[PDB]
Amino acid sequence: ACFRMTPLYNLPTHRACNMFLESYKAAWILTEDHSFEDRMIDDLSKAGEQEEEEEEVEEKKPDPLHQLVLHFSRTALTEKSKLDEDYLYMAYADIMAKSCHLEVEVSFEEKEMEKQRLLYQQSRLHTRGAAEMVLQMISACKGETGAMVSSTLKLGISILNGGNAEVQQKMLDYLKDKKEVGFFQSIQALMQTCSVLDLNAFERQNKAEGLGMVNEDGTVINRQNGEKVMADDEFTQDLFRFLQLLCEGHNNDFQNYLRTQTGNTTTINIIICTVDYLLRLQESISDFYWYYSGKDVIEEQGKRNFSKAMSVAKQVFNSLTEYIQGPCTGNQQSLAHSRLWDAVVGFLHVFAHMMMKLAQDSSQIELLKELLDLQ
Amino acid sequence: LVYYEGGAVCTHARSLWRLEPLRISWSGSHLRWGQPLRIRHVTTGRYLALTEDQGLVVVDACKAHTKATSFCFRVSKEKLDTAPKRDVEGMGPPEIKYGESLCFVQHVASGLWLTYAAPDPKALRLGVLKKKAILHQEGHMDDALFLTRCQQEESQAARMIHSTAGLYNQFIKGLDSFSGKPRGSGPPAGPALPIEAVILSLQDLIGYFEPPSEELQHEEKQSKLRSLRNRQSLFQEEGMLSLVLNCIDRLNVYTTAAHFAEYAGEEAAESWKEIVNLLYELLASLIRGNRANCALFSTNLDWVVSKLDRLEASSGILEVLYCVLIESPEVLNIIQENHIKSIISLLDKHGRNHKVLDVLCSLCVCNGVAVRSNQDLITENLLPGRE
Amino acid sequence: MDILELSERLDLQRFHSHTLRLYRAVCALGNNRVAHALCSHVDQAQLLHALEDAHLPGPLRAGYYDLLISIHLESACRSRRSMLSEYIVPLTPETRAITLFPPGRKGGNARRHGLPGVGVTTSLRPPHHFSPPCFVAALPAAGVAEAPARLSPAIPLEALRDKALRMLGEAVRDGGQHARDPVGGSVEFQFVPVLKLVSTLLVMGIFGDEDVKQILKMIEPEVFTEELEEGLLQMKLPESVKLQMCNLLEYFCDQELQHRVESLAAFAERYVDKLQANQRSRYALLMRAFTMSAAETARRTREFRSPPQEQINMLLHFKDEADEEDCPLPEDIRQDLQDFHQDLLAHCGIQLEKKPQSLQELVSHMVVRWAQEDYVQSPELVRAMFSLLHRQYDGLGELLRALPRAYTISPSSVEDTMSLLECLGQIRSLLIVQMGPQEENLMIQSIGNIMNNKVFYQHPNLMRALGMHETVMEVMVNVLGGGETKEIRFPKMVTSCCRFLCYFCRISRQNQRSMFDHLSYLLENSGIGLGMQGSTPLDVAAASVIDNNELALALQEQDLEKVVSYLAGCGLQSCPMLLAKGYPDIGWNPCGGERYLDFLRFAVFVNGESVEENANVVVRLLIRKPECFGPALRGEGGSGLLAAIEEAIRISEDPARDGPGVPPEENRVHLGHAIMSFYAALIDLLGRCAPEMHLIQAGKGEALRIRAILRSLVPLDDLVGIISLPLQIPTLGKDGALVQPKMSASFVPDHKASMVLFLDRVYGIENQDFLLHVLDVGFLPDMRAAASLDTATFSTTEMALALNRYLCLAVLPLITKCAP
Amino acid sequence: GVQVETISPGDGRTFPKRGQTCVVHYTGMLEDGKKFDSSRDRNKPFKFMLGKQEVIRGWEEGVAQMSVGQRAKLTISPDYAYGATGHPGIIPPHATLVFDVELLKLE
Single-letter amino acid, residue C467: G
Answer whether B287's CB lies under 8 Å from B293's CB: yes
Q: What count of other Cβ atoms lies within 10 Å of the Cβ of residue A56?
A: 6
Q: What count of other Cβ atoms lies within 10 Å of the Cβ of residue B2?
A: 19
Hey, is the C-beta of A60 within 8 angstroms of any chain C C-beta? no
Of the candidates C15, C34, C41, the beta carbon closest to that of B375 is on C34
Classify the phi-psi angles of C188: left when phi > 0, otherwise alpha if psi is within -120 to 50, otherwise beta: alpha
List CB contacts (< 8 A) between D91 and chain B. 384
Whether D36 is a known active-site residue: answer yes
Strand-pair partners of D75: D3, D98
Task: Report whether A227 belongs to an annotated binding site.
Answer: no
**CB B379 to CB D86 under 8 A?**
no
CA gap C129, C157 in Å, rounded: 12
Q: What is the largest CA-CA distance in chain B?
A: 90
Residue B37 is given by DSSP the state: E
Locate the chain D residue with the closest alpha carbon to B375.
D89
Residue C324 is given by DSSP the state: T
Residues 6 or more apart from A249 whose CB is under 8 A from it? A163, A165, A168
Whether D99 is a known active-site residue: answer yes
Which backbone phi and psi does B73 adopt, to 5 degrees?
-95, 130
Q: Which of C370, B68, A285 is nearest to B58 (CA)?
A: B68
Catalytic residue among D76, D80, D91, D99, which?
A: D99
Measured CA angle at C533 (ends C529, C538), to 5 deg: 40
Q: Do chains B and A touch (3 or more CB pairs under 8 A)?
A: yes
**CB C18 to CB B383 under 8 A?**
no
What is the rounded radius of gyration, in angstroms, for the C-alpha atoms of chain B? 26
Measured CA angle at C437 (ends C434, C440), to 5 deg: 75
DSSP secondary structure of A288-330: HHHHHHSSSS--HHHHHHHHHHHHHHHHHHHHHHHHHTTT-HH
**CB C31 to CB B383 under 8 A?**
no
DSSP secondary structure of C125-150: -PPP-EE---SSBPPPSSPTTTSPPP
**CB A79 to CB B149 under 8 A?**
no
Locate the chain B residue with the closest alpha carbon to A71.
B218
Residues 6 or more apart from C702 whose CB is under 8 A from it? C612, C616
Single-letter amino acid, residue A253: D
Answer whether B337's CB lies under 8 Å from B377's CB: yes
Single-letter amino acid, residue C628: C
Answer whether A259's CB lies under 8 Å from A269's CB: yes
Q: Among A174, A259, A265, which would you mutate to test the B interface (most chain B Cβ atoms within 10 Å of its Cβ)?
A: A265
Q: Among B375, B378, B382, B386, which would you mutate to test the C interface (most chain C Cβ atoms within 10 Å of its Cβ)?
A: B375
Hey, is the C-beta of D80 within 8 angstroms of any chain C C-beta? no
Resolution of the PDB structure in angstroms:
2.5
Answer whether C267's CB lies under 8 Å from C340's CB: yes
CA gap C551, A204 in Å, rounded: 11
Q: Which of B218, A94, A140 is nearest to C379 (CA)?
A: B218
List CB contacts (< 8 A) between B229 and chain A. 79
B359 three-class SS: helix
Which backbone phi and psi does B116 adopt, to 5 degrees?
-95, 170
Whether D80 is a known active-site residue: answer no
Q: Which of C23, D91, D41 is nearest to B386 (CA)?
A: D91
Q: What count of other Cβ atoms lies within 10 Å of the Cβ of residue A337?
A: 10
Residue C40 is given by DSSP the state: T
Answer whether C132's CB lies under 8 Å from C154's CB: yes
Of the candidates D26, D38, D82, the beta carbon closest to that of C139 is on D82
CB pairs under 8 A between B and C: 71
Of the candidates B99, B149, B218, the beta carbon closest to that of A77 is on B218
Angle subtended by helix axes A340-358 and A270-293, to nearest 10: 30
**CB C37 to CB B333 under 8 A?**
no
Q: Which of C520, C538, C521, C518 is nearest to C529 (CA)?
A: C538
What is the rounded radius of gyration, in angstroms, for the C-alpha atoms of chain A? 25
Residue C691 is given by DSSP the state: P
B225-232 long-range contacts (CB < 8 A, ≥24 apart) are: B225/A79, B225/B289, B226/A79, B227/B153, B228/B289, B229/A79, B229/B289, B229/B290, B230/B153, B230/B154, B231/B153, B231/B157, B232/B286, B232/B287, B232/B290, B232/B293
Q: What is the largest CA-CA distance in chain A?
A: 82
**CB D37 to CB C139 under 8 A?**
no
What is the rounded radius of gyration, in angstroms, for the C-alpha atoms of chain D? 13
List Cα–Cα distances, C390 to A91, A151, C130, C280, in angstroms: 8, 17, 37, 44
Hey, is the C-beta of C27 within 8 angstroms of any chain B C-beta? yes
CA gap D101, D22 in Å, rounded: 11
Q: What count of other Cβ atoms lies within 10 Å of the Cβ of residue C820?
A: 4
CA gap C574, C592 in Å, rounded: 9
Q: Among B101, B222, B229, B231, which would you mutate to test the A interface (most chain A Cβ atoms within 10 Å of its Cβ)?
A: B222
Locate the chain D residue with the closest alpha carbon to B383.
D89
Of the candidates D26, D85, D88, the beta carbon closest to that of C136 is on D26
Rounded to the nearest 10°, the torsion over CA D48, D50, D53, D54 is: 0
Hey, is the C-beta of C45 within 8 angstroms of any chain D C-beta? yes
The rounded Cα B375 to chain-centroid distance in angstroms is 36
Answer whether A232's CB lies under 8 Å from A194's CB: yes
Single-letter amino acid, residue A165: A
Of the candidates B99, B149, B225, the beta carbon closest to that of A79 is on B225
Residue C733: which H helix or E strand, with range?
strand C731-733
Answer whether C802's CB lies under 8 Å from C750's CB: yes
CA gap C523, C565 in Å, rounded: 11
CA gap D105, C51 in Å, rounded: 33
Rounded to the nearest 10°, the torsion over CA C166, C169, C173, C179 is: 70
CA gap A246, A131 in Å, rounded: 12
Measured CA angle at C255 (ends C252, C257), to 5 deg: 115
Q: What count of other Cβ atoms lies within 10 Å of the Cβ of residue C107?
A: 12
- Say how many Å lie between the first and final Cα of chain D, rounded: 27
CA gap A315, A320 in Å, rounded: 9
Q: What is the largest CA-CA distance in chain C?
A: 110
Answer whether D10's CB lies under 8 Å from D103's CB: yes
Whether D91 is a known active-site residue: answer no
Classify the phi-psi angles of C185: left when phi > 0, otherwise alpha if psi is within -120 to 50, otherwise beta: left
Residue C716 is given by DSSP the state: H
C88 three-class SS: strand
List Cα–Cα distances, B190 to B174, B196, C298, in angstroms: 8, 17, 110
List CB contacts (< 8 A) between C275 and chain A. 8, 16, 20
Residues 6 or more apart from A208 whose CB is under 8 A from it? C549, C550, C553, C554
The rounded Cα D81 to chain-centroid distance in angstroms is 10
B154 three-class SS: helix
CA gap A244, D41 in Å, rounded: 74
Q: Which of C398, C314, C408 is nearest to C91 (CA)?
A: C408
> How do strand C87-90 and strand C406-409 relate by DSSP bridges?
parallel
- CATH label of the domain that carries residue D93: 3.10.50.40
**CB A266 to CB B225 under 8 A?**
no
List Cα–Cα distances, A288 to A259, A307, B117, D2, in angstroms: 32, 12, 42, 93
Answer whether B299's CB lies under 8 Å from B261's CB: no
Strand-pair partners of C732: C738
Answer whether D12's CB lies under 8 Å from D66's CB: no
Rounded to the nearest 10°, the torsion over CA B162, B165, B167, B173 is: -140
List CB contacts (< 8 A) between C30 and chain B. 370
What secondary structure, in 3-state letters, does A243-293 show? HHHHHCCCCHHHHHHHHCCCCCCCCCCHHHHHHHHHHHHHHHHHHHHHHHH
Answer whether C760's CB lies under 8 Å from C686's CB: no
CA gap C371, C383 in Å, rounded: 12
CA gap C68, C155 in Å, rounded: 10
Answer whether A139's CB lies under 8 Å from A184's CB: no
Residue B213 is given by DSSP the state: P
Task: Report whether A216 belongs to an annotated binding site.
Answer: no
Q: Among A18, A43, A216, which would you mutate to test the C interface (most chain C Cβ atoms within 10 Å of its Cβ)?
A: A18
**Residue span of the structural domain in which D21 resides:** 1-107
C763-768 long-range contacts (CB < 8 A, ≥24 apart) are: C763/C711, C763/C716, C763/C719, C765/C814, C765/C817, C765/C818
A6 three-class SS: coil
Locate the chain C residue with the closest alpha carbon to B368.
C432
Locate the chain C residue with the closest alpha carbon to D60.
C138
- Say how many Å lie between the first and final Cα of chain B, rounded: 61
Strands (E), C585-681: 605-606, 609-610
Q: Do chains B and D touch (3 or more CB pairs under 8 A)?
A: yes
B120 exposure class (CB count in 10 Å sphere: 0-12, 13-18, 19+): exposed
B170 three-class SS: helix
Catalytic residue among D37, D46, D48, D100, which?
A: D37
Measured CA angle at B337 (ends B332, B338), to 5 deg: 105
CA gap C713, C644 in Å, rounded: 14
Answer whether B68's CB lies under 8 Å from B109's CB: yes
- Say how many Å lie between the first and final Cα of chain A, rounded: 50
Single-letter amino acid, residue B266: E
Strand-pair partners of D23: D47, D105
CA gap A127, A45 in Å, rounded: 11
Catalytic residue among D36, D46, D48, D100, which?
A: D36
Which chain D residues in 80-99 lie under 8 Å from chain B, judged by CB atoms?
86, 88-92
Measured CA angle at B377 (ends B371, B379), to 5 deg: 100
Strand-pair partners of D35: D29
DSSP secondary structure of C188-255: HHHHHHHHHHHHHHHHHT---HHHHHHHHHHH-TTTT-------GGGS---HHHHHHHHHHHHHHHHH
- Say how many Å lie between the first and final Cα of chain C, rounded: 105
Q: What is the largest CA-CA distance in chain D?
A: 40
Residues 6 or more apart from A141 whose CB is under 8 A from it? A83, A148, A149, A152, A186, A190
**CB D87 to CB C135 under 8 A?**
yes
Strands (E), chain B: 3-4, 17-21, 37-41, 47-51, 55-59, 71-74, 104-107, 113-116, 131-136, 365-366, 369-370
Touching subunits for chain A (3+ Cβ pairs under 8 A): B, C
> How do strand C731-733 and strand C737-739 relate by DSSP bridges?
antiparallel
Angle subtended by helix axes A252-259 and A300-324, to nearest 10: 110
Whether D46 is a known active-site residue: answer no
CA gap C367, A65 in Å, rounded: 12
Whether D37 is a known active-site residue: answer yes
**CB B222 to CB A77 under 8 A?**
yes
Domain count of chain D?
1
